[PDB]
Amino acid sequence: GSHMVNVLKGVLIECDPAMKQFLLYLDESNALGKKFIIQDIDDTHVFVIAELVNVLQERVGELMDQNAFSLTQK
Amino acid sequence: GSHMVNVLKGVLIECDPAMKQFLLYLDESNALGKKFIIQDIDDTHVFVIAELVNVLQERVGELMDQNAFSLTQK
């Protein structure tokens, strides 16, 4: 490679570094069928595209029981 | 203690901090009349919002001859 240049448009999110670790865990699982974390920025940051962040919103809120993700029949 | 929580929408940049350094000076100079660089996402990452990325585009494109950010009408 030449050098790291990642410039893109979407939603930038940070809160805490523990947060980072769950986004990774969720990317591992890919429970939402979307790869939300495009690049993670300086430890505590996650870059997710605005177009699909809505899946994260539901994951953050509803994942306690489950979020509505069943397109096996729809 | 504290920690930062920043969730934001716009354009994320990643490049070596050379860009950051002109950017901070330029932010400092406020030549573009807006705060383009919203948050320094620590040392290397820069965040600039898409609303005024256009301003940055012209800054990049036109700066060779002149960056005319002074528009009384044009």
Q: Token pair for residue A11?
A: 């939603």
Q: Is A41 helix (H, G, I), strand (E, B) or coil?
A: coil
Q: B41 and A47 in contact (C-beta within 8 Å)?
A: no
Q: Is B31 helix (H, G, I), strand (E, B) or coil?
A: coil
Give the DSSP letter of residue B17: T
Q: A30 and A68 in contact (C-beta within 8 Å)?
A: no
Enumerate the domain spans of chain A: 1-74
Chain B stretch 2-61, residues whose beta carbon is closer than 8 A to a beta carbon of chain A: 3-16, 41-45, 47, 50
Q: Token pair for residue A55?
A: 């899946």
CATH of domain A1-74: 3.30.70.1220
Q: What share of chain A is helix, strand, coil (3-state, %, to 5)?
A: 30, 15, 55
Q: A19 and B18 in contact (C-beta within 8 Å)?
A: no
For B39, which residue in chain A has the nearest alpha carbon? A12
Output b/e per residue, B3-33; b: 16+ Cβ within 10 A. eeeeeebbbbbbeeeebbeebeebbeeebbe
Q: Burial of B58 by CB count in 10 Å (0-12 exposed, 13-18 middle, 19+ buried)?
A: middle
Strand partners for A47? A12, A39
Q: Do B10 and A9 touch (CB under 8 A)?
A: yes
Give the DSSP letter of residue B48: E
Q: Token pair for residue A7?
A: 């410039």
Find, among A52, A11, A38, the residue nearest to B49 by Cα.
A11
- The whole-angstrom distance between residue A39's C-alpha and the CA centroid of its chain comes to 9
Residue A60 with chain B: CB contacts under 8 Å: none
After what residue numbers is chain A broken, C–N > 2.5 angstroms?
A: none
